[PDB]
Design a protein around this ligand. Structure first.
Ligand code: HEM
Ligand code: HEM
Ligand SMILES: Cc1cc(N)nc(C[C@@H]2CNC[C@@H]2OCCN[C@@H](C)Cc2cccc(F)c2)c1
Ligand SMILES: Cc1cc(N)nc(C[C@@H]2CNC[C@@H]2OCCN[C@@H](C)Cc2cccc(F)c2)c1
Ligand SMILES: C[C@H](O)[C@H](O)[C@H]1CNc2nc(N)[nH]c(=O)c2N1
Ligand SMILES: C[C@H](O)[C@H](O)[C@H]1CNc2nc(N)[nH]c(=O)c2N1
Ligand SMILES: [Zn+2]
Lengths: 409, 411
């Protein structure tokens, strides 16, 4: 019930007690581990225990647990739920909640940063045009001319579930994908379905390889509307290599701002279904996953050829050699253009320091090793050798399914 | 019930029913996943059900379930248990059991090979000298002058737990490690403690960087005895690089035969505490883990120095660049000397084919993603994108603690 985690490289042992505060279910059982599975309203009765649990943790954090102001706030919230079937968070509670949802995000390697998060309260937003304005401002603030700053923008909470705010896009900034008569895919194959929905709703597609998608915004449960983010707000980086002059000839670019827009933020039982957030990239996301996944831009074969490597046998490790060069290029290009990026060595080193901080100050740190270990060079980063316990704490970010299933037009 | 797994690269979905035959616990609960935790005598009462479950599985596999031969064997084993507190496996059952423990080993990427396993029955062994001879024969057979063949040697099972056979070595072939007074290590830092034990037991250590360790063998719960494997039986490969001629002067070599000697084989409730087994290497084990782990030979810096990489910032990815060249060197060296080895691209592609076949014919394939995904270039292998279900089937191989912690010294 008190659990140990060992680092096998350093022999450092840490004791986890924080897991006893976990509430939600993992998908694992005593008989079966689902650690590698990607995907393993509320009544008046359900809501007050969730609110109380959150408010207790909040008052504890500002060292006024059990105080008159603590008790008075639970009373106020209880009265509000009984009378209105929901409640409203104070600004201080919203900021605390959002920061802790990131602190609790077990799949995030970048959580050393969790307390530096700019929270934009968009709970007064009522229309899709309002949503577009908030999102442009988020984009501009976070981008900050390349000196990226972590931010979240929080739209109104769920009510009856028929008036949801949703950003239909999976990220604020992504590239279009189109199925070709030729049979191949042009652009990002990951975005073919979404690009189609955009065209159906009226988007005039440039039909290129790196077309920034428009936002499809849903306010108050209405049908979503299309908006183009001002091109001058979307900072993009041309990819070149410090040694290979031909690398720029591939015509690769990526955008500077990673901004997740499809998750659900739960704070004290309240559900924020549109809460786009952003930080900055770890280079392997772009160089390993976006560029080299077979189902993505899939560029390994082209780079390997330009490198004149022996592609006749797998054991020459041509894929591995080209992978490294692609990742050198991504980091170099971002660094040369003064756009914030972190390499996987540096990000995982910081995460180990964050884990030790959290064990020290909080009694643990939920972490999902399958996601935390980078998709290349796993065992030469310190997280590979670090045992991690994965469990679910609230406030939380949760995946939600694409709304084009949910939505009735 | 039915559990589904998806491959996120192919959208291929598979359905697991095999997990319903899982008995043992994972370490995980509804509230906590322990998937990255490395370590998450029986009564008559507990033994006959385990025996029966195993014999039922064995007789099904031979299409004789419920036959007179099946029923007679259940009866025979039941009588043996009630009267002697244990029972003996037939040779055929032992072979079946050992093959299935491999087939069930969820951390093993090499399982496409499971049904091709040479089983050496060493249950007539009585002394450490006898163990030494069996192990020499296993090494010679498995090595096969570089054309490696999978094998396992099975010593007598546990009785009262006071008479255990154990190989104290974690692998049959490993290099010594020596902590120096200045805090540095000569040789393999993974083997410092075991090396100190060998020396205490009377081994004359050459004190070099790649000294093959002697075997330390316990028969019948007696104190272990030291034996040197004949050097002519230990195949080794000097490591060189196809394009970098200075790579040879790093002085690196490795042994060809990976042979795990510290695991416990459970078949039908019986416990084989000494069951050394061997296959062949995947290149990354040596080039990534043995050479490049910080707590092992730790050669990354020296290699990248010689490659004249920019080592001022981790973001030049010098470690990644040096890692790839070291792994090319290991594969090239083994291949050039005609010693069996498999690269991680080939091994993972074969594992996916194995797993898909297993889902079709067996209803599942337990797999531990944390271990199956290679320690370099993870996502450019198909296994990275494959959802896996981890659960425990028997027969099985299990970790057991090192014997020096538990051994009752007799003197
Ligand atoms: C400050 C720089 C940040 C870095 C370097 C970083 C790093 C990462 C990385 C590499 C991943 C895995 C991404 C993937 O493979 O899809 C991730 C996941 C995630 N992070 Fe962060 N992160 C940062 C900021 C943030 C912020 C600001 C938040 C929320 C306020 C956040 C919450 C999450 C969540 C919920 C996931 C899982 C996403 C999913 O399930 O798709 N992170 N982080
Ligand atoms: C034939 C070629 C084989 C290949 C290429 C192969 C590959 C591997 C690899 C790469 C690992 C992980 C090693 C590590 O990180 O320590 C492993 C683990 C393992 N394999 Fe295999 N394997 C082979 C044969 C065998 C055989 C013959 C057996 C037993 C009969 C076996 C049973 C196991 C077990 C029990 C583990 C887990 C070891 C532990 O927990 O320490 N494998 N295999
Ligand atoms: C089925 C499924 C479930 C789930 N929870 N997430 C996904 C999204 C899948 C999971 N890895 C690939 C795809 O996301 C890529 C976007 N993630 C990055 C931008 C997150 C990020 C990084 C750095 C900073 C930051 F703020 C956010 C899919
Ligand atoms: C705490 C702990 C638990 C556990 N189950 N295993 C270990 C052993 C740890 C696990 N990775 C490092 C150390 O094994 C090194 C040996 N592994 C190879 C030889 C297995 C193998 C490969 C190829 C063929 C073959 F037959 C066997 C440690
Ligand atoms: C099947 C497996 O769980 C899946 O491919 C995971 C593995 N680890 C990952 N890790 C990160 N950071 N992001 C991912 O998308 C994935 N994909
Ligand atoms: C902490 C973590 O579980 C541990 O370092 C694991 C990760 N994956 C591994 N995978 C393999 N094949 N072998 C290992 O020793 C390990 N070590
Ligand atoms: Zn689990």
């Amino acid at each position: 019930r008190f659990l140990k985690v060992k680092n096998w490289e350093t022999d450092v042992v840490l004791t986890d007690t924080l897991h006893l505060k976990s509430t939600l279910e993992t998908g694992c059982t005593e008989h079966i581990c689902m650690g590698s599975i990607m995907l393993p309203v509320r009544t008046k009765d359900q809501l007050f225990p969730l609110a109380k649990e959150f408010l207790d943790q909040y008052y504890s954090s500002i060292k006024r647990f059990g105080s008159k102001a603590h008790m008075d706030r639970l009373e106020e919230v209880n009265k509000e739920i009984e009378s209105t079937s929901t409640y409203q968070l104070k600004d201080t509670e919203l900021i605390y909640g959002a920061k802790h949802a990131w602190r609790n995000a077990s799949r995030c390697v970048g959580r050393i940063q969790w307390s530096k998060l700019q929270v934009f309260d968009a709970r007064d937003c009522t229309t899709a045009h309002g949503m577009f304005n908030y999102i442009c401002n988020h984009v501009k603030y976070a981008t900050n001319k390349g000196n990226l700053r972590s931010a979240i923008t929080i739209f109104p909470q769920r009510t009856d579930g028929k008036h949801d705010f949703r950003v239909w896009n999976s990220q604020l900034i992504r590239y279009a994908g189109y199925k070709q008569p030729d049979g191949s895919t042009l652009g990002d194959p990951a975005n073919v379905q979404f690009t189609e929905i955009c065209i159906q709703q009226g988007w005039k597609a440039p039909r290129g390889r790196f077309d920034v998608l428009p936002l499809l915004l849903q306010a108050n449960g209405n049908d979503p509307e299309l908006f183009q983010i001002p091109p001058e707000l979307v900072l993009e980086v041309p990819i070149r290599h410090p040694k290979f002059d031909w690398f720029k000839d591939l015509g690769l670019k990526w955008y500077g701002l990673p901004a997740v827009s499809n998750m659900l933020l739960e704070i004290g039982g309240l559900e924020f279904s549109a809460c786009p957030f952003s930080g900055w990239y770890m280079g392997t996301e772009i160089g390993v996953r976006d560029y080299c996944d077979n189902s993505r831009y899939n560029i390994l074969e082209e780079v390997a050829k330009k490198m004149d490597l022996d592609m006749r046998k797998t054991s020459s490790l041509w894929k591995d050699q080209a992978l490294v060069e692609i990742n050198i290029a991504v980091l170099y290009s971002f660094q040369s253009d003064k756009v914030t990026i972190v390499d996987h060595h540096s990000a995982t080193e910081s995460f180990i320091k964050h884990m030790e901080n959290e064990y020290r100050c909080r009694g643990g740190c939920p972490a999902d090793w399958v996601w935390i270990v980078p998709p290349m060079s796993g065992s030469i980063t310190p997280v590979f050798h670090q045992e991690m316990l994965n469990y679910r704490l609230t406030p939380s970010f949760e995946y939600q399914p694409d709304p084009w299933n949910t939505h009735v037009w």
